[PDB]
Amino acid sequence: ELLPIELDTLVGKGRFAEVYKAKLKFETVAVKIFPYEEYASWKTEKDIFSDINLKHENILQFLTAEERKTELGKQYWLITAFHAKGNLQEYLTRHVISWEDLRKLGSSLARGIAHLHSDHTPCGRPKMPIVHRDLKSSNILVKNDLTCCLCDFGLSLRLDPTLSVDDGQVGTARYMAPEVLASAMNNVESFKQTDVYSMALVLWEMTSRCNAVGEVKDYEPPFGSKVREHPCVASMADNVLADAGRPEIPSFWLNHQGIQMVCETLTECWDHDPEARLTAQCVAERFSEL
């Protein structure tokens, strides 16, 4: 029961896996390949993608997981929809986006996160919340219709009441909330608030490349003008925590009313105080009012 795949091109490398554009005999699929040593990440993602209640337009569509014996030993595959327009970071690097693009990307991002965060299904029944714990533009995929979907659940945490104190600062230092950089966390709502902080930075990346503001600069990642290519937690703590630093919002951006509203929403969402941040649900609601 192994699918007829042929690995065309490496499109991704992370800590845990390589991602390949491949063919199924839809002819175009993504194949995420984990070595045996990264079994844990494959399983964490597999369990999220296999969960009946995490099927959503704004979550990457999963076909199947496979175990594939090789000469070196064994590989662990996740086979998913392939989004040809690539991850949001690559997309914002390549393109200046319209107001309409920003509204679709931003709304779809917030609806995807709010769905992960929700303690209930649409049809009202309870579900254990997931927090992504590594939200960033390279972990968001641009669909042909210019909506986002979430992927890369390798570091995700099921908000399980049995989770021990030992169960730190896993994830990408650049996108880490001040309370994570400070090691100043406990709330349950605490991990949801860290996702929202990272989401804010991504809304900023989208806004930074939106032609509604007027003149658009080249894409740079959040804090790109202040920290090295691969910033450590210490450097991030100095910027985000010690200097209360956030990506720059030039005042001329606020002259467009849409951009102004997005900049006010995302600014609340990257507040030093996690309790000051909006919920993903609240952000999705503001985006629909646009």
Curated annotation (Swiss-Prot):
Changing S198F: In LDS2; has a negative effect on TGF-beta signaling. GO terms for molecular function: activin binding; activin receptor activity, type I; ATP binding; glycosaminoglycan binding; kinase activator activity; metal ion binding; molecular adaptor activity; protein serine/threonine kinase activity. Changing N186S: In a breast tumor; signaling of TGF-beta significantly inhibited. It is a single-pass type I membrane protein. The keyword RNA-binding does not apply. Its main location: membrane. Changing E275Q: In esophageal cancer. This is TGF-beta receptor type-2. The lineage of its organism: Eukaryota, Metazoa, Chordata, Craniata, Vertebrata. The gene is TGFBR2. The chain holds residues 240 to 541 of 567 of the full protein.
